[PDB]
Symmetry: none
Subunit: 121 residues, 4 copies
């Protein structure tokens, strides 16, 4: 297993990221959950692909699962995730290694080989 | 210097990419320029010199493909061949990408001197 | 002008249709737009102006429901509520239909000026 | 209907213009359409239907000249006959112009329904 952190919203994400700033951080940005209905279909498709490829990450990695909030919050073009100078999120799902060019979006987050490449190097 | 190819449109990109498939390819996708070198894509204008002075960080034997996607009116079409390509999946210009990898920069990140260095660096 | 309702998703369409059940209902089913006003459905983009300039041919008290079915990822789901509804039985976007009738146009026929006129007139 | 002339290239355009010099001429300059295919000019393709549906606003005597300037490579030549012509002074395609007047629309303005109606009226 790889360490995983589950956060809801930008403040909770920021705390997790700042407390792991010394580590190999991978982050998935996805829509919030009717508990057991995500509003983001491509998020739901990505989760299991990401889950089965996390083993390819280097041993002491940290996986942050970040729920961005409700669809209406996410649709706000000026929301904190879209305007963050490092995250610069354009959509959910996004898989990213913060502060690097390593990014996958939408259907690419369910692409088994690209997700393996993302975690492995 | 690093080998550079300058291509205009999808079929010309496709030829360069397929003839260099055995090589370490970096690609920049930008708006086409006018007859005075004038560009409709302001973020593309900004990115060009940052990318130019960081290419030296790419490995030896890299190939840099400078791809003009065409006019604004071509690019504005949400169904254009660059956006629908299953590998490129372009969402905006400028895009800096290693095709078939997670290595991608978009818009103002293409003019970020440290992210562009990191993108080329190996 | 003809009365127009703009709805997003199945629940909002269902409200509009049930509150207009005593009226002459025309419905367009289209891919959802981005903040950018931009569409993932190119046949939907081509149809809206054709439909906009032919709506004047509808009987004066008609009700035109513009229904955004959701994102591509929602629509691609072959079992989604729009495709499975017993009355709508949507097979594609765009679809122009008078619910519970044989009157239906799909894909490029929604940008056919004479067939769109015929649909409303 | 309004009289229309379809010409390919400068010499053909010059013959149509000179043979109609007594008349109210409107001219559209667009890219050539390659064999079995559309043009290389997307803004030309967008303009054509807007222009076609507003031509009825033109006055009595009117003549509409549809002029293909040639291939993209010819057009991109900054010294080509259309760009250098002392009356046409073309800067881009599409261009809608009443030769020898200040009446001119370019690029996206050629698909602006109200500016095109105004140009013909």
């Amino acid at each position: 297993m790889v360490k995983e952190i589950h956060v809801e919203g930008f403040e909770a994400y920021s705390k997790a990221a700042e407390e792991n700033n010394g580590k190999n951080i991978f982050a998935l940005f996805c829509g919030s959950k009717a508990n057991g209905e995500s509003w983001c279909p491509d998020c739901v498709t990505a989760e299991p692909v990401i889950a089965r490829n996390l083993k390819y990450a280097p041993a002491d990695s940290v996986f942050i699962h970040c729920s961005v909030g409700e669809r209406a919050f996410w649709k706000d073009q000026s929301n904190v995730f879209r305007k963050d100078p490092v995250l610069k999120l354009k959509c959910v799902p996004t898989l990213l290694k913060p502060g690097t060019p390593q990014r996958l979006e939408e259907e690419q987050c369910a692409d088994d080989n690209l997700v393996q490449m993302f975690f492995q190097e």
